[PDB]
Scaffold this active site. Structure first.
Site, PDB file in Angstrom:
ATOM      1  NE  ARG B  16      -3.922  -2.110   2.264  1.00  0.00           N
ATOM      2  CZ  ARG B  16      -4.469  -2.777   3.284  1.00  0.00           C
ATOM      3  NH1 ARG B  16      -3.873  -2.534   4.533  1.00  0.00           N
ATOM      4  NH2 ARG B  16      -5.204  -3.268   3.091  1.00  0.00           N
ATOM      5  NE  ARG B 157      -1.424   0.840  -9.370  1.00  0.00           N
ATOM      6  CZ  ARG B 157      -2.741   0.869  -8.644  1.00  0.00           C
ATOM      7  NH1 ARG B 157      -3.109   2.162  -8.079  1.00  0.00           N
ATOM      8  NH2 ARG B 157      -3.697   0.068  -8.964  1.00  0.00           N
ATOM      9  CE  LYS B 168      -6.482  -7.147  -2.186  1.00  0.00           C
ATOM     10  NZ  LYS B 168      -7.163  -6.738  -3.151  1.00  0.00           N
ATOM     11  CG  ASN B 194     -10.540  -1.719   0.462  1.00  0.00           C
ATOM     12  OD1 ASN B 194     -11.358  -1.500   0.826  1.00  0.00           O
ATOM     13  ND2 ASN B 194      -9.405  -2.351   1.046  1.00  0.00           N
ATOM     14  CD  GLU B 198     -11.595   0.728  -6.221  1.00  0.00           C
ATOM     15  OE1 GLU B 198     -12.607   1.389  -7.166  1.00  0.00           O
ATOM     16  OE2 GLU B 198     -11.311  -0.322  -6.599  1.00  0.00           O
ATOM     17  CB  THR B 238      -4.294  -2.692 -10.958  1.00  0.00           C
ATOM     18  OG1 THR B 238      -3.410  -1.284 -11.490  1.00  0.00           O
ATOM     19  CG2 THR B 238      -3.558  -3.359  -9.951  1.00  0.00           C
ATOM     20  CD  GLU B 242      -5.546  -6.682  -7.745  1.00  0.00           C
ATOM     21  OE1 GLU B 242      -5.332  -7.138  -6.445  1.00  0.00           O
ATOM     22  OE2 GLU B 242      -6.065  -5.434  -7.784  1.00  0.00           O
TER      23      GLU B 242
END
Ligand SMILES: N[C@@H](Cc1c[nH]c2ccccc12)C(=O)O
Ligand SMILES: N[C@@H](Cc1c[nH]c2ccccc12)C(=O)O
Lengths: 252, 252
Positions: B16, B157, B168, B194, B198, B238, B242
């Site tokens: 984070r 990023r 996770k 999340n 956001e 992103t 994931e």
């Protein structure tokens, strides 16, 4: 500023704008370099570990010289505002040339303080901006590429003084012709220096150092140190470029 | 975050903080690219005036492909957080290799959305951050180099999703193993999303956009545009990373 229209370049209002544009640029580049330790090994010539084949010289030098050779083929150094670090290493372009007008005096490309710039960057600047002392073995590449960004912005900002000098020259030919013919460096210095404009610059840098990089939501850069770098490195070397350019102004 | 100490990488808090540091880098780089026009020719393959010897592809591609080859020789892509735009061109490093322990699944390098990143940057981001539309033939190189900077930051990023997904997956193996099994893309999606965070990111972005680039004593970046770029481009690609990563976790 259009380097193909001499009149937009030799415009002082314009030159000013670019320098402002350049300081924010330098600051952003310093903030990115501030995320890593000093990595003394990135700068040592032929360091035991970072041993580049067929290459004497530092890890940074390798990365920089290599970047320059690539850029030179794509006309990087034909532009009047771009000065090489490894002038002897650069190649000719393989692209059709842009016929740049003759803006500055023909010896302009010889006024090259890059050796001095790389030296004080390494010795006086890395120490003030790095995160901590020591090598960060896993980030030598991250560090060198950030170093190149910083070196190239400083180099241009500083070499921009050739443009600043010419612009001042045109605005008061008589004054500067007197000074130049009598080699009055002190007169040239006194004249190209504006203590009130510098004061303002140093004030602006302190506030920019205070709001940049810090999440508006502690300080990636220490205001005192940024002001110190400008006051002692950037501004002084720019004047060295200016007076050197001027003393040869009326040569051939 | 040290990529040789597994326990530091798979730390949600550490991840984070990394992403939050990358925000600033992306903003700084958007501000830099913003000083120039759109320069469509830089992105056009084998363009008449920008014809490069023995190379098919744009001015951008040559500059990018050459940078990666160079950087691969000095270990750039051995780091798990670096994904190349040109996988078939990178080479083995000539420096001693750093032994990074396996942290992500073995197939991690295969999850490479760089092509999509290059296209959306060219088609959707450039029009939003550029100064004006049109070619500026005296700044193709200056433009290509600012682009690379942007792309490399966007790429790092976005592919950091790989790390987010794993931390996770560890954090809740029973659930994710469940979702991955029945391929609940919507569930992984909802689980990885999340929401309340956001909104925060977007608020932080608006504020940073309002402060960076502007003299604290002009708006180089339009906040609403930065928010749109993150909301529609960065955060969503992103997630596709994931998701693709998670769906292949138990695929061994
Ligand atoms: N601005 C000039 C010079 C230049 C700066 N950076 C470059 C990188 C590559 C080639 C040229 C350049 C150009 O874009 O051509
Ligand atoms: N951070 C790693 C990988 C890396 C990132 N950027 C680089 C640029 C050049 C070489 C390596 C890198 C290193 O410094 O080794």
């Amino acid at each position: 500023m259009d380097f193909t229209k001499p009149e937009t370049v030799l415009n002082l209002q314009n030159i000013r704008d670019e320098l402002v544009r350049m300081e924010d640029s330098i600051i952003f580049k310093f903030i990115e370099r501030s995320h890593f330790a000093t990595c003394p090994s990135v700068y040592e010539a032929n360091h035991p570990g970072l041993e580049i084949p067929n290459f004497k010289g530092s890890f940074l030098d390798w990365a920089l010289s290599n970047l320059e050779i690539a850029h030179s083929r794509i006309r990087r150094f034909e532009s009047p505002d771009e000065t090489p670090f490894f002038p002897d290493k650069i190649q000719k372009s393989f692209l059709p040339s842009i016929n740049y007008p003759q803006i500055l005096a023909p010896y302009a490309p010889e006024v090259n303080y890059n050796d001095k710039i790389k030296k004080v960057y390494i010795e006086k600047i890395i120490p003030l901006i790095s995160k901590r002392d020591g090598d960060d073995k896993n980030n030598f590449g991250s560090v060198a590429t950030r170093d190149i960004e910083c070196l190239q912005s400083l180099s241009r900002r500083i070499h921009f003084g050739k443009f600043v000098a010419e612009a001042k020259f045109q605005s008061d030919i008589p004054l500067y012709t007197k000074l130049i013919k009598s080699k009055d460096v002190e007169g040239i210095m006194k004249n190209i220096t504006n203590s009130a404009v510098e004061e303002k610059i140093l004030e602006r840098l302190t506030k920019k150092a205070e709001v940049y990089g810090v999440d508006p939501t502690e300080r990636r850069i220490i205001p005192e140190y940024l002001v110190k770098i400008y006051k002692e490195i950037v501004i002084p070397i720019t004047k060295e470029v200016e007076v050197e350019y001027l003393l040869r102004r009326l040569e051939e």
